[PDB]
Amino acid sequence: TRFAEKVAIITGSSNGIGRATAVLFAREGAKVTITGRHAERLEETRQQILAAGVSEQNVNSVVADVTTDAGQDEILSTTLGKFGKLDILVNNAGQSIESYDATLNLNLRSVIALTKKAVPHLSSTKGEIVNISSIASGLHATPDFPYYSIAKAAIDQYTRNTAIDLIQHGIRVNSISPGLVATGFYSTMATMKECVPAGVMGQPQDIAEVIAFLADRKTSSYIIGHQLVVDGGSSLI
Amino acid sequence: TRFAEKVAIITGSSNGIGRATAVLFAREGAKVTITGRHAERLEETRQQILAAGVSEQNVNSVVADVTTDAGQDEILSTTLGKFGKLDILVNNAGQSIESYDATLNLNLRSVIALTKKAVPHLSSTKGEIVNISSIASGLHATPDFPYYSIAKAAIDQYTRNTAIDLIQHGIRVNSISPGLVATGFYSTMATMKECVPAGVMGQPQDIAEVIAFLADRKTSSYIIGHQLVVDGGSSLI
Amino acid sequence: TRFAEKVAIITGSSNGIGRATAVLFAREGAKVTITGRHAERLEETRQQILAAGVSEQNVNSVVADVTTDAGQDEILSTTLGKFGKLDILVNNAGQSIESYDATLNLNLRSVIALTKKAVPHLSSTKGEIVNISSIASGLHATPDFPYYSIAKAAIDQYTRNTAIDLIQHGIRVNSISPGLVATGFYSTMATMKECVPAGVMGQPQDIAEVIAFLADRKTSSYIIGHQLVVDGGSSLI
Amino acid sequence: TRFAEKVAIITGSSNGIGRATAVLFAREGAKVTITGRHAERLEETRQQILAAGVSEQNVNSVVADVTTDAGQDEILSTTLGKFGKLDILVNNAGQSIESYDATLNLNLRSVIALTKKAVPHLSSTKGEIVNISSIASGLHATPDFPYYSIAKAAIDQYTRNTAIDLIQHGIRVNSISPGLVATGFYSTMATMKECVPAGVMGQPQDIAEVIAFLADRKTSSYIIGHQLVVDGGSSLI
């Protein structure tokens, strides 16, 4: 299967998108490092991987704060130690000024810091980076998520910037902007049909498939620095 | 393989992108209708499909002018006759005012006309539409291709519009904007490295993989009305 | 006043935006050519100009079909004859395939044809071109206006393309994408407040001011090839 | 003149864009608060205002660090004290993770913090906010300015977000993305002609005119949340 002999780090993999991505990549033969601050949620991800029939040897669980220098180093050091290399990095991490600081620290700062540390290793394997953004970022307003949206807008710009700089080191960088996603009455179902053209709510697995597509050169090698929107058409309304 | 029991029409399949797409889909198990005005070029596509080991029964060759009402009807009538249904439509068709007229007629008008005719059948199979545009269309200038670019810009808008309207009929619509693609010295290689961040020229197959990705619900169901750029990063420079 | 000793052609000036623009420019001292197919509506524009206290000598009324070669030539020939030169061109001209043809002919084809004819004269005065588009064109869907929207999307691309090509001839090109505009209960007022963030409906004069801004080098010389959205914030929702 | 009886705060007004904007607004009759950390550079701005014939009573000079809570409060408290109200706010403030922190603190954090403090007063006068961004932010890569560009991308998103939220309080918000601007051989002149379609380098005054346009409801009331690019066409290449 694709990703055989590939090693991937998936941040924010203790739930939803990150979790589904880890399970998918693992099932695809990759050697995955899952990480998060909530050990119990993270172990649940590990259990879904094992349940899928994947060997426990292909999973590296790291409980850490990705916003700290030590957490970042631990995430990276344990993956290189156990797997020997790094091929894929899926950056899936993530009102008062205090909320602004916390929001940008997690959604932007930690991604930049972790990525800079991973670059040397990704260059060695001519790896891939997939940044998870959000349609919160786009040519429209997102007042309900003031700081999350601008942090993601910076993530989009960061993706374009790093894609051009890092491709010179054999690294492919792209991003995905998911719309509404659940599974991580009549009135609610009606509104759903109205707000999501697709007529169905997005699923963690739907996003995981797209992440895999972008992490696999066999299927997307010529796609570079693109912001791939996966929102059932919501942002077009 | 994916696309098994699926029927696809690929316009502009007598060369490059269209040809590689037809071969890929056929190899994937789909029943394909290839079409173009140059019979010899089209037969060459058919031969590559056969050479790939695909049964001749899975290929419907239609020599016709996709800009004419009759050509359009022939393309569609022969596919429904031989295959009984239609699941996928890959719209890959495509200075003086005369050049403007010819350019828009082929790149925009014929696509709209063919699509309108296909809609009823695509609705029946909850099919997919993949419109092939170009980075000639985008938030930048493209003076070397005055009419081709604006026609593609209309294709992008048309894609967004139809994606929202047609998803109500179970049809998924998306588009792809390819950058430079070849295979359909030192100075030239240097300039190439400079103009294409990827450092390598795009290949027809690279675009075909992305078309397949978008035509396959298993891999992209939640992607709707998106303009997927596949240009090795060129448009970001 | 600005536009003194300047000559401008305003198409679609028999009503709304075009009419308000003609009155504004005339009041600003420019020598204006108004045009349209409905003579009575056009004369009404002329009367508003005269009522504003502008000399009848500064107004050239041309009743013609801007989609025809003859109409185009008449519009241009009469302006150069009466005024001797051309400084500004405001291109404000503007389902079955038949509706598609009519829509693109007026909204795209005629603009390209007229502009090509005006270029030589605009180069002589280092003039300005202001293309009137619509938020119907943008990174979103516009299903209620299928052909009008794609034609405007092509207008946006055309604006970017010509801005780069024509600036080499001393001509500045930009475009404006107006949102909802009127003046060319409680339930309706409520919905209005909801659909237009501005809380007030756009007015022809609001758009005219922006056209003047872009036609005046003293206020916007460094703005080139930009798509200026004037929609009270509607497209951001 | 426009801006008569209007009070404006212009950050980063000790040089270039900010300085030219302060001089323009002052000459237009507004009561302006200029601010910066370099007292001598700031006084130079004041002197240009006085030299323009403006009364010293219409200028409030505040030497402060706009990134600090105290600087922000001083900037605002002195303007309200001396002028009694606030109508316009022009936010013109503005590799290792350390550089990232410093860059975002100045270009994003301080703007959000200052703006939140100004909002109450801007609501009272149904004021205007003009955020100065950069073409460093856009649908392209900007590798030479890694953190400055992403901070500006967040500024663009922030502008769209606040425009929708604040218009409900009678406040108009927009942003401007300047290209290359100087004045704050043959080989260099050649390259310039090549990199800037306009064929001429942007001037601080060129940007100031656009800021004034957006701060004046008489000329741009219906423009809301728009990212106005003023780059001589550079970003389109």
**For residues A75 and A62, is the Cβ–Cβ distance under 8 A?**
yes
Nearest CA-CA partner of D9 in D103, D100, D73, D98? D73
DSSP secondary structure string, B95-123? --HHHHHHHHIIIIIHHHHHHHHHHHHHH
Q: How many CB atoms lie within 10 A of CB B47?
A: 11
What residues does D43 pair with on adjacent strands? none
Dig out the tokens for A190 from the structure.
Answer: 């009606």
Give the span between the Cα atoms of A224 and A220, in whole angstroms: 9
What type of residue sits at position D217? Answer: R
Q: How many CB atoms lie within 10 A of CB D6?
A: 22
CA distance C231 to chain D (A): 6
Residues of A in contact with B164 (CB under 8 A): 197, 233, 236-237
Give the span between the Cα atoms of D159 and D165, in whole angstroms: 10
Are C209 and D220 an interchain contact pair (Cβ–Cβ within 8 Å)?
yes
What residues does D130 pair with on adjacent strands? D90, D174
CB-closest option in D112, D153, D165 to A154: D153
Adjacency order of strands within the sheet including B128-132: B59-63, B31-36, B7-10, B88-91, B128-132, B172-178, B227-230
User: How many residues are present in chain A?
Assistant: 237
What type of residue sits at position C130? Answer: V
State the count of interchain CB pairs (< 8 A) between B and C: 83
Phi, psi of B233 (to 5 degrees): 95, 0
What type of residue sits at position C224? Answer: I
Give the span between the Cα atoms of B111 and B128, in whole angstroms: 14
Q: Which chains touch B (3 or more CB pairs under 8 A)?
A: A, C, D
Give the distance from CA C89 to its chain's centroid.
8
**Residue A114, SS3 per DSSP:** helix
Are D207 and C225 an interchain contact pair (Cβ–Cβ within 8 Å)?
no
Catalytic residue among B148, B158, B186, B222: B148
Which parts of B13-61 fold into alpha helices (H)?
A: 16-27, 39-51
Q: Which residue in A135, A222, A224 has the most chain B C-beta atoms within 10 A of its own C-beta, making it the best mutation to test that interface?
A: A222
Give the span between the Cα atoms of C162 and C112, in whole angstroms: 10
Please count the CA atoms within 13 angstroms of the CA of A177 that sit on its side-chain side. Answer: 29
Minimal-distance CA residue of chain B relative to A203: B222
**For residues D41 and D16, is the Cβ–Cβ distance under 8 A?**
no
At a CB cut-off of 8 Å and minimum separation 6, what does C187 contact? none
Give the span between the Cα atoms of C199 and B228, in whole angstroms: 35
Nearest CA-CA partner of A163 in A219, A102, A91? A91
**For residues C114 and C69, is the Cβ–Cβ distance under 8 A?**
no
Give the span between the Cα atoms of A146 and C89, in whole angstroms: 41
Phi, psi of B109 (to 5 degrees): -50, -55
Please count the CA atoms within 13 angstroms of the CA of A167 that sit on its side-chain side. Answer: 29
Are C164 and D219 an interchain contact pair (Cβ–Cβ within 8 Å)?
no
Phi, psi of B90 (to 5 degrees): -105, 105
**Residue C112, SS3 per DSSP:** helix
What type of residue sits at position D140? Answer: H
Residue B52 buriedness (CB in 10 A; 0-12 / 13-18 / 19+)? exposed
What residues does D16 pair with on adjacent strands? none
Give the span between the Cα atoms of D31 and D86, in whole angstroms: 9
Phi, psi of C120 (to 5 degrees): -50, -45
Minimal-distance CA residue of chain C relative to D222: C232
User: How many residues are present in chain B?
Assistant: 237
Residues of A in contact with C233 (CB under 8 A): 141
Strand duo B227-230 + A172-178: pairing? unpaired
Adjacency order of strands within the sheet including A227-230: A59-63, A31-36, A7-10, A88-91, A128-132, A172-178, A227-230
Give the span between the Cα atoms of C104 and C13, in whole angstroms: 19
What type of residue sits at position A68? Answer: T
Give the span between the Cα atoms of B18 and B210, in whole angstroms: 12
**For residues D75 and D33, is the Cβ–Cβ distance under 8 A?**
yes
Strand duo A88-91 + A7-10: pairing? parallel
**For residues B177 and B158, is the Cβ–Cβ distance under 8 A?**
no
Give the span between the Cα atoms of A49 and A36, in whole angstroms: 16
Residues of C in contact with B113 (CB under 8 A): 97
Q: Which residue in C103, C109, C150, C171 has the most chain B C-beta atoms within 10 A of its own C-beta, making it the best mutation to test that interface?
A: C150
Are B236 and D138 an interchain contact pair (Cβ–Cβ within 8 Å)?
no
Q: Which chains touch C (3 or more CB pairs under 8 A)?
A: A, B, D
Nearest CA-CA partner of A171 in A179, A161, A181, A163? A163
Please report, for residues B21, B36, B40, B209, the alpha-carbon distance to residue B63 in angstroms, rounded to integers and kept in the order given.
Answer: 18, 5, 10, 25
Dig out the tokens for B223 from the structure.
Answer: 């992607």
Tokens 């992305």 found at? B210
Phi, psi of D80 (to 5 degrees): -70, -35
Phi-psi region of A198 (alpha: psi -120 to 50; beta: other; left: phi over 0): alpha
Adjacency order of strands within the sheet including C128-132: C59-63, C31-36, C7-10, C88-91, C128-132, C172-178, C227-230
Measure CA of the first residue to CA of the last residue in chain D; give whole Å.
Answer: 38
Taking the alpha carbons of B184, B185, B188, B193 in that order, is the dihedral positive or negative? positive
Dig out the tokens for C126 from the structure.
Answer: 């280092």
Minimal-distance CA residue of chain B relative to C114: B97
At a CB cut-off of 8 Å and minimum separation 6, what does A112 contact? A158, D97, D100
**For residues B114 and B42, is the Cβ–Cβ distance under 8 A?**
no
Catalytic residue among A100, A148, A158, A222: A148
Long-range contact pairs involving D54-60 (C-beta distance under 8 Å, separation at least 24): D54/D26, D54/D27, D58/D26, D58/D30, D58/D31, D58/D32, D59/D26, D59/D31, D59/D32, D59/D33, D59/D34, D60/D31, D60/D32, D60/D33, D60/D34
Phi-psi region of D199 (alpha: psi -120 to 50; beta: other; left: phi over 0): left
Give the span between the Cα atoms of A8 and A10, in whole angstroms: 6
Measure CA of the first residue to CA of the last residue in chain C; give whole Å.
Answer: 38
Query: Running DSSP on this structure, what letter comes out for residue A128?
Result: E
Nearest CA-CA partner of D221 in A212, A157, C202? C202
Give the span between the Cα atoms of C151 and C142, in whole angstroms: 12
Give the span between the Cα atoms of D102 and A3, in whole angstroms: 39
Nearest CA-CA partner of B22 in B57, B55, B48, B53? B48
Dig out the tokens for C10 from the structure.
Answer: 């305003």
What element of type H or E holds C137?
none
| Superfamily in which the D1-237 domain is placed by CATH | NAD(P)-binding Rossmann-like Domain (3.40.50.720)
**Residue C61, SS3 per DSSP:** strand
**For residues C157 and B135, is the Cβ–Cβ distance under 8 A?**
no
Give the distance from CA D98 to its chain's centroid.
25
Taking the alpha carbons of A69, A74, A76, A81 in that order, is the dihedral positive or negative? positive
Dig out the tokens for B232 from the structure.
Answer: 């090795």
CA distance C193 to chain D (A): 10
At a CB cut-off of 8 Å and minimum separation 6, what does C61 contact? C33, C34, C35, C42, C43, C46
Residues of A in contact with D112 (CB under 8 A): 97, 100
Q: How many CB atoms lie within 10 A of CB C167?
A: 22
3-state secondary structure string across chain D: CCCCCCEEEECCCCCHHHHHHHHHHHHCCCEEEEEECCHHHHHHHHHHHHHCCCCHHHEEEEECCCCCHHHHHHHHHHHHHHHCCCCEEEECCCCCHHHHHHHHHHHHHHHHHHHHHHHHHHHHHCCEEEEECCCCCCCCCCCCCHHHHHHHHHHHHHHHHHHHHHHHHCCEEEEEEECCECCCCHHHHHHHHHHCCCCCCECHHHHHHHHHHHHCHHHHCCCCCCEEEECCCHHHC
Query: Cα A159–A66–A77 angle (5° rounding)?
Result: 95
**For residues D233 and C167, is the Cβ–Cβ distance under 8 A?**
yes
DSSP secondary structure string, B158-219? HHHHHHHHHGGGT-EEEEEEE--B----HHHHHHHHHH-TTSS-B-HHHHHHHHHHHH-HHH
Please count the CA atoms within 13 angstroms of the CA of D209 that sit on its side-chain side. Answer: 17
Helix B204-215, helix B16-27: angle, nearest 10: 50
**For residues B145 and B179, is the Cβ–Cβ distance under 8 A?**
no
What element of type H or E holds C8?
strand C7-10
Q: How many CB atoms lie within 10 A of CB D199?
A: 14
Query: Cα D144–A75–A28 angle (5° rounding)?
Result: 95
Residues of B in contact with D141 (CB under 8 A): 233, 236-237
Domain borders along chain D are: 1-237
Are D231 and C210 an interchain contact pair (Cβ–Cβ within 8 Å)?
no
Give the span between the Cα atoms of C134 and D201, in whole angstroms: 30
Dig out the tokens for C85 from the structure.
Answer: 């030169």
Tell me how the structure was determined: X-ray
CB-closest option in D167, D168, D223 to C210: D223
Question: Dihedral (C-alpha) A144, A147, A152, A154: value to the nearest 10 degrees?
Answer: 140
Which parts of chain C fold into alpha helices (H)?
A: 16-27, 39-51, 69-83, 97-104, 110-125, 146-166, 186-195, 204-215, 217-220
Q: Which residue in D137, D140, D229 has the most chain B C-beta atoms within 10 A of its own C-beta, making it the best mutation to test that interface?
A: D140
Dig out the tokens for C190 from the structure.
Answer: 């409520």
Give the span between the Cα atoms of C152 and C150, in whole angstroms: 5
Residues of B in contact with C146 (CB under 8 A): 158, 161, 165
Are A225 and B197 an interchain contact pair (Cβ–Cβ within 8 Å)?
yes
Query: Running DSSP on this structure, what letter comes out for residue B235?
Result: G
Give the span between the Cα atoms of D200 and D194, in whole angstroms: 10
Nearest CA-CA partner of B107 in B87, B83, B88, B132? B132
**For residues C141 and A236, is the Cβ–Cβ distance under 8 A?**
yes
What type of residue sits at position A70? Answer: A
Taking the alpha carbons of A38, A41, A43, A45 in that order, is the dihedral positive or negative? negative
**Residue C197, SS3 per DSSP:** coil
Are B108 and C143 an interchain contact pair (Cβ–Cβ within 8 Å)?
no
Nearest CA-CA partner of C225 in D77, B141, D217, B76? B141
Interior/surface letters D156-188, b for 16+ CB within 10 angstroms, e for the rest:
bbbbbbbbbbbbeeebbbbbbbbbebeeeeeee
Give the span between the Cα atoms of B65 and B88, in whole angstroms: 20
Give the span between the Cα atoms of B86 and B68, in whole angstroms: 20
Dig out the tokens for C97 from the structure.
Answer: 């395939």
**For residues D208 and D12, is the Cβ–Cβ distance under 8 A?**
no
Phi, psi of A145 (to 5 degrees): -135, 65
Give the distance from CA A182 to its chain's centroid.
16
Query: Running DSSP on this structure, what letter comes out for residue B234?
Result: G
Give the span between the Cα atoms of C213 and C203, in whole angstroms: 16
Q: Which chains touch D (3 or more CB pairs under 8 A)?
A: A, B, C
- Expressed in Å, this structure's resolution amounts to 2.1
Give the span between the Cα atoms of D233 and D237, in whole angstroms: 7
Give the span between the Cα atoms of D42 and C108, in whole angstroms: 50
Nearest CA-CA partner of C230 in D224, D152, A23? D224
Give the span between the Cα atoms of D36 and D34, in whole angstroms: 7
Taking the alpha carbons of A78, A82, A86, A89 in that order, is the dihedral positive or negative? negative
**For residues C10 and C25, is the Cβ–Cβ distance under 8 A?**
yes
At a CB cut-off of 8 Å and minimum separation 6, what does C213 contact? C219, C220, D213, D219, D220
Minimal-distance CA residue of chain D relative to C208: D219
Residue C178 buriedness (CB in 10 A; 0-12 / 13-18 / 19+)? buried
Give catalytic residues of D, as residue numbers: 148
Give the span between the Cα atoms of B20 and B90, in whole angstroms: 12
